[PDB]
Each structure stands twice: as structure tokens, then as C-alpha cells.
Nucleic acid binder design. Sequence first.
RNA 1: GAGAGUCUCUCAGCUGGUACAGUUUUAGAGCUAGAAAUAGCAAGUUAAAAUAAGGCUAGUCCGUUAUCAACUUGAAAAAGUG
DNA 2: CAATACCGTGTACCAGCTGAGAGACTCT
DNA 3: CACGGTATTG
Length: 1330
Amino acid sequence: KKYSIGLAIGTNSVGWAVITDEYKVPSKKFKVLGNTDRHSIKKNLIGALLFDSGETAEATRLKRTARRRYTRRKNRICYLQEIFSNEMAKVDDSFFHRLEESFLVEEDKKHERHPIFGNIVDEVAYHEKYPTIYHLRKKLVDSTDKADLRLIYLALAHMIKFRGHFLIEGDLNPDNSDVDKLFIQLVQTYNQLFEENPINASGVDAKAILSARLSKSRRLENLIAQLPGEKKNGLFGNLIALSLGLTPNFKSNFDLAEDAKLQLSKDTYDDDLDNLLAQIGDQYADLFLAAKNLSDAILLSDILRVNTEITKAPLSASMIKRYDEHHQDLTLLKALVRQQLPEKYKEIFFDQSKNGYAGYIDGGASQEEFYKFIKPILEKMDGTEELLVKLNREDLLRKQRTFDNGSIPHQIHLGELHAILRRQEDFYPFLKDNREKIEKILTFRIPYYVGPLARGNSRFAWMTRKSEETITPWNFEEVVDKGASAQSFIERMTNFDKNLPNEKVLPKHSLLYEYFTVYNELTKVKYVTEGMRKPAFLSGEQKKAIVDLLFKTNRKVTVKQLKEDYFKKIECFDSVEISGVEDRFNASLGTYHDLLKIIKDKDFLDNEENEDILEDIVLTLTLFEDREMIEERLKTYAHLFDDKVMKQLKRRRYTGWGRLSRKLINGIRDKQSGKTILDFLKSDGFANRNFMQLIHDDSLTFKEDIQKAQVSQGDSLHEHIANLAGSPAIKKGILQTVKVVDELVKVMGRHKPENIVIEMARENSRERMKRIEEGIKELGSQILKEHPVENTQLQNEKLYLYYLQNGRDMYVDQELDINRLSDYDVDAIVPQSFLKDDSIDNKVLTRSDKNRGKSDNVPSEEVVKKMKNYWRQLLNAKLITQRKFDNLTKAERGGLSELDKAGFIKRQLVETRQITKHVAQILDSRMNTKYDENDKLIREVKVITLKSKLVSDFRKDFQFYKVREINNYHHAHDAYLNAVVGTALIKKYPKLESEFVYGDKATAKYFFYSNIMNFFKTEITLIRKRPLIETNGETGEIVWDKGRDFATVRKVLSMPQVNIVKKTEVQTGGFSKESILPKRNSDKLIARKKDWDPKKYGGFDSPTVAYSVLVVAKVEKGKSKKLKSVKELLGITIMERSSFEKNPIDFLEAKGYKEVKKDLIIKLPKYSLFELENGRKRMLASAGELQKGNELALPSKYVNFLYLASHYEKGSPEDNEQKQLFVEQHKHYLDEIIEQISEFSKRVILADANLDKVLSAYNKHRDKPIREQAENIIHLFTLTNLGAPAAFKYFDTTIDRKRYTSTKEVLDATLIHQSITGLYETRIDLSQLG
RNA sequence: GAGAGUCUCUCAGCUGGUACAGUUUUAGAGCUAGAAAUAGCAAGUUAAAAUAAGGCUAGUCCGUUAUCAACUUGAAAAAGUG
DNA sequence: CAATACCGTGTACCAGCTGAGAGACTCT
DNA sequence: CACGGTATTG
Ligand SMILES: [K+]
Ligand SMILES: [K+]
Ligand SMILES: [K+]
Ligand SMILES: [K+]
Ligand SMILES: [K+]
Ligand SMILES: [K+]
Ligand SMILES: [K+]
Ligand SMILES: [K+]
Ligand SMILES: [K+]
Ligand SMILES: [K+]
Ligand SMILES: [K+]
Ligand SMILES: [K+]
Ligand SMILES: [Mg+2]
Ligand SMILES: [Mg+2]
């Protein structure tokens, strides 16, 4: 028996079908195991496996790292307490015990309830003196008196526990950067460089203007207004803007050709500045560094809002300023509300449920919600002007612990810590001896290139130790091998050379690698002149001269430079034609020029004797990121360079790795020639062979040595699937598809199919907001100031396009109107009739698509000439990608050629994604295993890959319409159709095997691939007809009988029995919801620690059931404890699972059950299937809830009527009228549809209230247009859909979900265990238990 | 058809180092009039601790990804069964 | 046992490696 | 998000 398999691989479904030679789906009797009446069952060989989406590893990672975070912060606190141990025991022998048990209720505390001092008087006195921890911090920093050791510990521990970020390197002092003085020094430098045009900065209060709580451009405008005759876009204005963090363009200032866009926040700035300094000289360096100092001062003034000369604790002083202004403004507001609005005082200051001050301090209202609740109250009253100013400033009634404290560097807390230590070490010797230890506890963080400090039990760790002892912050450098660990951090992730699998790949910025790339590109260049008969290669001498003259003096080498600076200067050619390179050479010797600028010794770089050294240098600069370690490694070359050069080298860092090893490039040599690959690239006679030719040339030993260098352990199926590149969800689909195919082959008597057809489906507002913000601030536009928008709003396609286009038409140089977006047009850059791309990367917002030009191509040349500069501005602002820009500008490059259109249609039909090829390879290597007499693979099974458009057009052309919302059958159906089309297609044109089977003029191919599917049609327009029977031309075998086979497909799509199977899965992941709920009298609360009784301490609820368990046992009853037989579902929770599996009997007996029938324990994962009466089916949602378990097999006529009537997705107007006439002639179908649903709901769904409401809603809108009634009947199928119940809407009526909140009935129903395909079953009558 | 290097991007996956909030219990003596229910008023900004229960391998480590119908033999990994 | 309604930890930064989609140059 | 847990009302 011959058959083929159709597969439909999705992210939540794998559809499968089996077809015969006639495109029929077989049906078998399958054995049914179990204890029921039924010994066998009839099954069609079509169905679909359904599963929950596979999840990535990200969330797990973030939780794991948060875990390490909390562990290490606790360890810091433990280090500090161990330092304070003895002297604190001398002063108060229970302080740390009181701190530890602070969380406990006084009933469970072992010591006094007042943490700090242990008696109420002292505690109240403390809090009255220091209402916030910042008061105590400022006191301990500024005062000179001896202080209580407990208060010292509290300050230092608060600093260590919340120590602040590490985004700034080096040290930082409070008065290191004062805005006034740095602005004055910037004015000094500017007037030193520009004596003829000086600025009068007298009377300009730079402090308040730059350190104001305002946007960057607003403070810029403020300071520029204070300087008459100076504009914000002049030189000084741009310097201030760069200080304020904007993106100034110094081009117009210095009359530059290169766009000198400088933004200090960028990683490129260090280069972007130097590049600029290359054009205007080094006299301007002092200026551009004074501006950077000013920027640092402004950044600090953001955080420290107090004078740094009255205290050494500017941060704590600013927190105390927050507290004092909170107190004053709260007193004023209370008085104001007492006087003017005395009825609202209670709602404002007593009601936690409201977003007033009560909800702000005691409830759950945030600063933002509080400001929103209290702004109208302030505007409504009199005397609230300053309060409203502070509110719009986001500085009213501030707390100290807020969301925006993430700005605080750790250097600040460190300064305060160091100050306290210097104060109190005069009174405590142990603080003098352990000052640096405590400072280190604060400053030290495990380096990212070292990872978890494990000892052989972490699967994530790679760190290597210099000595075997406990790692502490004070011996890290001596116990951890920072060098070996930093090296392993990279060498455990970097590729080896595929040609030499034992050799490491070179750094991308290595000098040798760039030499290789340049020579490889340069070897295939060809040139022609007049007297020359034929185009020539460049000789070895010519290539060397072009490298020395051009590539070693210019960063980039254009074609024009090649023509004028070599062929004219050396060869005396006035005209020459070049091939093998266009506009400019892609390769270049960037590292050569970097090192030439740093060391300034060209003869050192050109000397081959230094090659090794240079490589090592670059290696280091690439392998490491810590400048101290780079310095340590380069120390062995300190004698070759000045100290200025060695510092400049330290700062020079590279990222990236190539794809070939040094041994391949310039190591292995050809036996006879004695030359390396690079030696051939430099000079290879008149052949000029490049890398591919070199390693593929049988006359050379490179190919032989590459063959010899190869090595093998083989992955398993699952391991091999896991190591593919792709979403983990699609990978889950791949593995399930393989398992389905294995079962299907086992079904067909271990006979392998003829062909297997596979189709794979295709593949955030915060990201959109970030893109638009960055693009507009880089563009310098004020559209956001004038049109504020939230991230959610950007989910509208037109508004997102409007903003990405700076509010302007993309085809016309004119502004657009937000309030008119509904009148505008979204147009595809390349037409969707060629490239089916609807992404933002191919779409464009324009006033009218007519203005694009002709609709049969790319935007016309006139539009390109008009809009090229605007498009390049959008490109540099990253508001359009380079791909979008190239497509937009293609008309100046000839536009769309006929070859491009042919390729686009081919892409529409021929699958080229790599993940699909990997699926095909897996199935192929699984099925075809034998080799013939020539030791070539015997391809018994042909694996065909199709794209969804083929079967989609098939459905839309032969009226095999699909409606996804009706049921899950469409997946299965898709599979079937694929298997059909696929097979038929390759039977009709066997030459297509090349492009459609795994394994090894433009108008003509356009026409061909556009008409490839016409052999199914009977008549074709653009109007010759076709036979009723389509056969293969050469073999004469029949492939499609247009009078019998369509009937076959219709009968297959009409079959009501389709094996839909929802994959039962144990639940995993978090134990429960994460919210810590307050204490409550409820056994649903779960203790967050072993002794934290939730009735006193609160805790969690809502745990996830890993899997239910059927228990047949006895439970005690009443006060007598009489044993009563029971049969029920106990939900084992994820957190209980290990304990329940280690010993199920003891777990159950501790849960209450006695005399447990151990062998009648049935493990029920989620989606376990139960059948009750009248074919009614339920799936296990949990231990106490059920999901719908039946599919509604709506007949095909109603499906197609719903598709056509609702205008689901056209064709000829005559065919459109015929479809409309069929819809209107079959209007009664509507009622019939309802009837079917009704008969289903009364039989399987059992939601009387919902069904009656839906029937009334349908009988209410019977005067609505047929299209809308059908569109809402589509909604109605949520009532019958398999799975969890959900709420839907019929027109404007809303039907809430009827839930199945009890699982008692399934305990007497028939449990059904299904194989992956649902063909094999085991049925268990549960009524026979108990 | 199957690929390779380079260039210009774009998306994705995987790992590590940190920070700020949030929440929970306790501590920040509420006062007065009332026997009480309650009413009037004062006050509020902070800290400690926990942040998957926990585990043994005891590390400044690990604990939410992937994988899983049923049945026999299996100790388990497996393999086999219509 | 009803319907029935409400609720669900979030944000930010820094460092790195890999594949792959798509346009272009050169090739097996 | 959905869809399972939870309390409320009855
Ligand atoms: K006690
Ligand atoms: K001015
Ligand atoms: K709050
Ligand atoms: K807080
Ligand atoms: K080029
Ligand atoms: K590096
Ligand atoms: K030196
Ligand atoms: K899972
Ligand atoms: K390539
Ligand atoms: K209290
Ligand atoms: K599992
Ligand atoms: K199953
Ligand atoms: Mg812990
Ligand atoms: Mg906190």
C-alpha cells in the first residue's frame, strides 16, 4: 500500500493527514485497550495535535539572577555584622538578634519588641531625633562626637544594603563638578579660542538654569535666551546642548563636510570626537572637554539638590530637603483644606481606598496616581500656586524611597560611608583597622566575566580558582584567577574554524584577518584600458602597491581613488574600467589605521617581525574588557612604546570574532608551492585564485588538509532540535512533528510513505516608544513636545508611521495632520503583488498613494529626487532602516527589473527559510538510510516543502474556504491539502524536484512561476482552456482528474470525525502567584517561611496544580472520626510535587486520607480527557475546574457560506456577483447554523443561561445586514470552541463565560488516554472504582 | 539546487554582573470626651527582615527553560505492545 | 452546588557570544 | 493576555 503524509507545523498545533494515490484519506479499525465495552474503534487518518506554546528561557534567567542578587546582598550584611560582632556584643549583646527577628509578632519574639535600643523611651527618642535614616546618615557624616555603635551600624548597613548603581567608572567627588564654575570655565575656553567673538556671561545664573528640573532643550533655550546675539544652534549653543545630553551637530559650526554628530551617552562618542578633532585640530580639544565636565556637573546636580559646602552628605541632605518640604507642604495643604473644603478632608487624609494622601502613604496609590488625584483639588482652591508648581515639577510631598533613586551612583553612598568611618574610627580601633574592608564590601561586585563563584555544582559557572578556599570580597584578586576566568568567559562561547575544527577563530579586528579580507576582495578585481585586448587581473606587485599607496593611507578606498591615485599616478592611464568592486571597497584595514594613530610608527606596523606582537595586542584588546587586565597583559610590551602610547592603547578596545583561524589564513602551506592562503591571495600568477578556489583546488594541498582536519559525539533527536536557531515554540512544534511522523509510520505497518509534504507557518509598544524617542531626539524635532503620545497608542499602524515620519508625507515634502490620519493612505514601497510584506519596514504613510507614481513598480524617480535627503535624515535617525531606504530609492538604480519580479514570485512559492530546511533534513535523514552501488543516498521518501500561499490560493480558488474560529479542524485540513497539492505538483512537473524536494529569460520564469498552479484549473484567463484530465507529459501517468478528485477533496474536508488531540502536559514554573497577600483567616494562604503562620504574617495563595491525582481511600468524618469511603481529585501543587512523588502514600496520609488504594492512583495532567453521556467530553483544567472537550463539526456548506457572507477575505466581478447571489439564495442557512450550534450546546456545552441569551440576541438583530450577522455568528463559536470557556460578544451583547467549577462528574465517567495522534486509545471506566 | 568569505543593516536566541521600586509583619508611646458603640482632633515621608517553600553537593552554589497518553519488563535509562 | 466579579510583581542599566533574513561584491 | 484561583452572595 502506497501513501503520503501531509504536515502543518505551527507554534500551537501540528496538523497531519495521510493520503493514498487517489488523494483519499484511509480509515482503519484501531484496537481500544481498557475496561469498557468498546474493543475497537473506526478512525480516519487525519487530525491535529494541539499544545501550549513553548516558552523561552528568559524569565527563568531573570528570576535566577534576582535570586543570586538577594543572596549576595544578604551576604554583604552578614560580612558587616561579622565585622561588628565583638564590640557590639560589648555594647548590646542582643542588637543583631532583635534585628533578625524584627519581622516576628511580639508573641513569637524572643527579645524586646523595640529593635534599636530595646526600650520604648530610647526608641521614641531616636525616631524623634532622626525621623528618617538620612537624618542619622547626615549626622554621622557631619558630627565629630562619639556615637552609639548601633547607630553607626545602622547607617553603614543601610548604605551597603542599598548601595546604588555601577554605571560610572572611576572616582567621584561631591564638589568635583560645580555647574557655575564649569560653565564659567567653558566660557573661559570659548573666549580663549574665539577672541574676536566673545560672550558676555555676567549676570547669567548658570546654576539655577542648568540644574533646573526641566527638559534638556528647555534649559538650553533658557540659557541661550540669557545670551543676546547667540543662538541655540551656534557653537556655544551646541556645546551647551552637548553638555545637556542632546545630540548636537557641530558640522555647521566648523564648516565640516563630515556630519559631526556628538552625543556623550553613545559608545561611539570617544571616536566621533577624535574624528571631529582630526578635521578642526587639537586646539578645540580643551573646549570639548570643558563641556564634558559641565555635563558631569549637571548630571550630579540632578541628584544632589543641596549646596555641597555646608555638608559632606549632599545626598542625605537632599533627602532631608525632601522630608522638610513634604512636612511644610503637608501642613499648608491640611490648613488649606480645613479652611476652604472641609468636607473633603476625611476622603483626602483618612481614606486608604481613595488616591489621596491616605492612599498615598498607607494604601496602594503611587506618586503619579496621587498627583493625578490631587491636581484638580489644588487648582480648585486658592493659595496652591507653589504647590501646583512643585506638582508639575514632580517634587511635591516626595518620599525618600522612590522609583527614581536608580540614578544614584554607588560613589555617593561610598563617600558618605567613608566620611562616617573617618569620623568614628577616632573612637573605635576596629573601625580604623576595618575601614578598607567595609569600603570594599560596599564597592566590590563579582565581575560579569567571572560569573557564579561555584565549586563544581553550577551548570552555569566557568570561574577558575588560583587556590581552594572561600572567596571573600577582600581576597577575590588572590583566590579567583581573573585572567583564566575572563578568558573562559569568551572561549566557551566562540566558534572554532569549521575548516580546522581544533583552531580558534581570529579576532575580527586582527591585522592578519583584515589583510586577508582586503587581499581576497582585491584579487578578483579586473581592469581594462584602450590598448588591452582583454580585461586583466592585478599582479602581485600591483596589489602590493595598491595596498601600500591606498589601503595604508585611507580608511576607505573608493573606485575613484583606485582610478586616479593608482592607475593615473603609476600606470599613466587617463581612462580605465574596473570590475569586481563598485563605488568603494568593502574590505579595509581599519585596525591598521587605529594602531597607526595610536603608536605613530608606520615602519613598526609594516615590519613583519612585529606581526606576532601586533596580533597578540589585538587579541588582548578583543578578549578582555577590563582596562586593568588589558594593561596587565600589554605590560610585556611596555618597552616598545612610550607611556602616552601605552595609555592610548589601553583605552583602545575591539569586539567581535571572525570566521577563520590564523592557521588557515597564514599557517598551513601547500606542499609543492610552500605558500599559505594569504601568500596566494597576495600573488597567484595570472590565475588570481581566491579563498574558495584555493580550498577547492585539487592541484593544491589545502583541500586535502581541510578534509584531514575534520573530526566527528552525535546529538540525540531532542538535543539536535534544541541546538537549532529559532523560537523555542517552533522547536517544540518540530519535535512533535517528528514524533507524529514516527507514529504514523508505525500505523501503516512500518511501511514508509512515498512523499512527506511539510508547510511551516510564518513568524513591544515600549520598543516602539524607545525607537520614536531616540529618532526624534537624534533628529532634533519638536513633534513630541507638540503631540504627546503613550506607548499603547503606537499600536495603531498609521500613528506609528506618522511619528516615524516626523509627521510628514513620505512621498511629498509637506506636513501631515494627526486629526486627519483616517483620510491618509498606507502604501507598500514595493507592491504587495510582488512582495507580500506588511511590516513597517515596507509600509509608508502618505497623503495619497497616487503620489507614489505608477502602482506597477517602486516609487518613481521624481519622488526619489524630491525625498532622498529627507529619507537619509530618517535613516540616520534610525526612523527607517537601510532596507526600507534602499527599497524607497531603487528607482534611481533602475527600479524593479523583470528578474526581480520573477524572483519575488518564486519567493512567494518556494520556501527558503533555514528552519524549514532543517526540519526537512531531519525527516529525510530519518526516512532515507540506505546507499546504492555508488554509495549515494537512496531517496525512497521525498520530503517536499511548500509555503502557505499555495494551499491558501488553492482554497480561495476552488472554494475550500476556511474559518479558523469554527473549530480546530482547519489545521488538519491544511495538512491534507498540502499533501494533495505537493504530490500532485511534483507529479505534474518532476523537474521542480530541485526546488521542492530536499536533497542534491526573466519573463519566461515570471510567466512560468505565476502560472505553475494553472493545471488544476479548467479554464484560465490571461483565455485558453485545459483538459479535464491532467497527466504527466513524459510518463503519461495521470495526476489530476478534474471531475473526480475535487469530489474526493470535498468528501475529505466534509468528514466530521477528525482526531484533534490536546497534548496533556504537567504544569511547571512558579509555585503560585507572586503577590504577598496580607494576613487573613483562610486556609488558602501559604507560608512564605516555615514558621511564618499566614494567619499572623500573610503569604501567598493561588498555587498552580502540577497534576491532579485520583484518590480512592477513606477519610475520617465528624467528631467520631468514622472512616468513610471517598473517590475524589486531589490537585498536587508544583511545590508539593517532589514530596508527593518521593512517597505518595505518606503524602496522602498526611493530607488526611487513610487506606489508600495505591494501585488505583491515576496521575491526571492538565487537559486529561473524560467522556460522559451523549459523547459529551471534558478536559481537566485543574483539580477543581473543567474545560470544554468536544469539537463542533459544522458541515462544509455552512462553513463556506459563513466565509463568503462575512467577506472573510476577491476575483472577477461576475464571480463576485455569483458568490453574492449564492449567499442571498442560501439565507436560511443562517437559522440552520444557529440550530446546529443550539443542538450542540444543549448536548455538550450545557450553559442554559448563555444559550438563551445568545438565542435572544440572534432573534434581536435579524434585521441587520447579512454580512454583519455572519461576522457575529463567527463570534458565537466561542461558546462551542474546545478549551477553556471565554467571554464573547454578539453585536453589542456580551456573553460572559460559563465555567465548569466542579470536577465531581469525571470521577464516574470514562477517562481516555490518547497516543500523540489520537488513533490509539485506552479507555478506563472510572465508575468501576470505589 | 547546496553552500563560503566580505560589507551594510535588521531580528532573534543563550549566558553573566548589578540597581531601583513594590509587597508583606514588626518598630516608629496617638490624644481627648465618653462605661461602651463612637465623635472631635493630632499624625503620616523612615527602618529591620523576607522575596519562590527550600535542597545538599554546604558553593558568596542550586531551586520557574526544554522533555512527559496508557500498558508490560525494567531498579532507572530504556526497549517493546495494537 | 450557582452566577458573579475581581485579580494576577514591575522597572532600569551594563558586558558578551551565536544564528539568520535581506540587499550587495566575489566565488565553490 | 487568558484562564485558573479566590471570595462574595445566595
Ligand atoms: K516576647
Ligand atoms: K539670544
Ligand atoms: K501607596
Ligand atoms: K518604601
Ligand atoms: K561596494
Ligand atoms: K573587548
Ligand atoms: K617605554
Ligand atoms: K513545562
Ligand atoms: K552569505
Ligand atoms: K506602629
Ligand atoms: K515533566
Ligand atoms: K497524549
Ligand atoms: Mg533565600
Ligand atoms: Mg523596600
